[PDB]
Design an enzyme around this catalytic site. Structure first.
Site, short mmCIF file in Angstrom:
data_model
loop_
_atom_site.label_atom_id
_atom_site.label_comp_id
_atom_site.label_asym_id
_atom_site.label_seq_id
_atom_site.Cartn_x
_atom_site.Cartn_y
_atom_site.Cartn_z
N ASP A 46 -2.00 1.90 -15.68
CA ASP A 46 -0.71 2.48 -15.27
C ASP A 46 -0.83 4.01 -15.24
O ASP A 46 -0.72 4.65 -16.30
CB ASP A 46 0.37 2.06 -16.25
CG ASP A 46 1.72 2.64 -15.87
OD1 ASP A 46 1.85 3.10 -14.72
OD2 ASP A 46 2.65 2.51 -16.70
N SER A 73 3.90 15.10 -0.87
CA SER A 73 3.56 14.62 0.47
C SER A 73 4.10 15.57 1.54
O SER A 73 5.19 16.13 1.33
CB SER A 73 4.02 13.16 0.68
OG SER A 73 3.88 12.73 1.97
#
Ligand code: NA
EC number: 3.4.23.22
Length: 330
Positions: free
Chosen positions: A35, A199
Site C-alpha cells: 500500500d 498530473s
C-alpha cells in the site's frame, strides 16, 4: 541488494493485489497488500480477536526465534474506506522477494474492522508511503522500504500491476525489460506523507487533451481512480446511460456499454487507461448496472491515482534524497 516479488489480484475485478512476505524464523509466509498510501506493516496474528479472523493466515510471534516485543508500542490506523485495525508491535526479520530487513516493526493486530475480517485473501498490509505517516506510538517506526533503502543497489521500488493478471514489485532496481519507451519522472511532495504529484491533464477517449494541474497521490492500496468532479463528469458524459447514483455510491453505467479510454498526463508524457480497466462489473450479482472505475474525489479531500491508473503503467517510486515518481507505458 535487490528484491523481486510477484503480486496477484485477489479476485476477478483486481480489487486489490497480494504479495507473499516472509516474516520470522523459520519463515511464516503471509500474503500482504502493498500500500503506497500508508506506512504501517501490520498482520493478522495469534493476538487477533478470534471472532475477527475468517480464513486469513496469521503471524505467531511466539513461533519465531527472531521476534521481540517492542515494549510499550501500540498502533492504530484508519483508512480512506472507513476500515481500521490496531494492536501491539514486534520487531522481526521480514523478507520480500529475496530482500531481507532485520529489526522490522511488524504491527500485530489485536482488532480489525469487518472489511478486513471479510477479506480472507489479505493477511495484512505493507505500507510504502513515507515513514512520517507510521502510526506506532510512542516511537514512530520505519517502513520496510525505508529500512531496506541503504542496502539497496538504488533507493527505488517499482510497481508493475497487472490487468486481470499477476504483476511485480521490485526493490532496488529498474527492470528495463518491463516497460516500453522511456520513463517520465515528476516531482513529489512529501508534505502529507504520500507519493503526491501533479498530473498535467487528461483526455477522454479520442478527445483532445485538456492541460490542467491535478494534484493527487499514487496509491496502490486504493482500487479506483478518484479525480475532481469536473473531470469525472466529462468522462461519464461520453457513456450513454451513465449516471451518478447516491444509492450505489458513485457513477454506474449500463453493462452493455463499451467504455472509452482515459488518458492522464505525466509531464509531456501520456498514460492511457483502456476502457476495459474502468469496468468494475455488476453493482450486485446479476445486475445490468455496472460500477465505474473512475469516481469523484469530492468529499475525500485528495485525488487518488489508485490501481485503475497505476496498472496502466510501470511506476517508479524513487526514494532518493529528493523523491520523485516515474511513469512509463508498458
Ligand atoms: Na465496491
Amino acid at each position: 541488494s535487490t528484491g523481486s516479488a510477484t503480486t496477484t489480484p485477489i479476485d476477478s475485478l483486481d480489487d486489490a493485489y497480494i504479495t507473499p512476505v516472509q516474516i520470522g524464523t523459520p519463515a511464516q509466509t503471509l500474503n500482504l497488500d502493498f500500500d503506497t498510501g500508508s506506512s504501517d506493516l501490520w498482520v493478522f496474528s495469534s493476538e487477533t480477536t478470534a471472532s475477527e479472523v475468517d480464513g486469513q493466515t496469521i503471524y505467531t510471534p511466539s513461533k519465531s526465534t527472531t521476534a521481540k516485543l517492542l515494549s510499550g508500542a501500540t498502533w492504530s490506523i484508519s483508512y480512506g474506506d472507513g476500515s481500521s485495525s490496531s494492536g501491539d508491535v514486534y520487531t522481526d526479520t521480514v523478507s520480500v522477494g529475496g530482500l531481507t530487513v532485520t529489526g522490522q516493526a511488524v504491527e500485530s493486530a489485536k482488532k480489525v474492522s469487518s472489511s478486513f475480517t471479510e477479506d480472507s485473501t489479505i493477511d495484512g498490509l505493507l505500507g510504502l508511503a513515507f515513514s512520517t505517516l507510521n502510526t506506532v506510538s510512542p516511537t514512530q517506526q520505519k517502513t520496510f522500504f525505508d529500512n531496506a533503502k541503504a542496502s539497496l543497489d538504488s533507493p527505488v521500488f517499482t510497481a508493475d500491476l497487472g490487468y486481470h493478471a499477476p504483476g511485480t514489485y521490485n526493490f532496488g532496481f529498474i527492470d528495463t525489460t518491463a516497460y516500453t519507451g522511456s520513463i517520465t519522472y515528476t516531482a513529489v511532495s512529501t508534505k502529507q506523507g504520500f507519493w503526491e504529484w501533479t498530473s498535467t491533464g487528461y483526455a477522454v477517449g479520442s478527445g483532445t487533451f485538456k492541460s490542467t494541474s491535478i494534484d493527487g497521490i499514487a496509491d496502490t492500496g486504493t482500487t479506483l481512480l478518484y479525480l475532481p468532479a469536473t473531470v469525472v463528469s466529462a468522462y461519464w458524459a461520453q457513456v450513454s446511460g451513465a449516471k451518478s447514483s447516491s444509492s450505489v455510491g458513485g457513477y454506474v453505467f449500463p453493462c452493455s456499454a463499451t467504455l472509452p479510454s482515459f488518458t492522464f498526463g505525466v509531464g509531456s508524457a501520456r498514460i492511457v487507461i483502456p476502457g476495459d480497466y474502468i469496468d468494475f462489473g455488476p453493482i450486485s450479482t446479476g445486475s445490468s448496472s455496472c460500477f465505474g472505475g473512475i469516481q469523484s474525489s469530492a468529499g475525500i479531500g485528495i485525488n487518488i491515482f489508485g490501481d485503475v491508473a497505476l496498472k496502466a503503467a510501470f511506476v517508479v517510486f524513487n526514494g532518493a534524497t529528493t523523491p520523485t515518481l516515474g511513469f512509463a507505458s508498458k
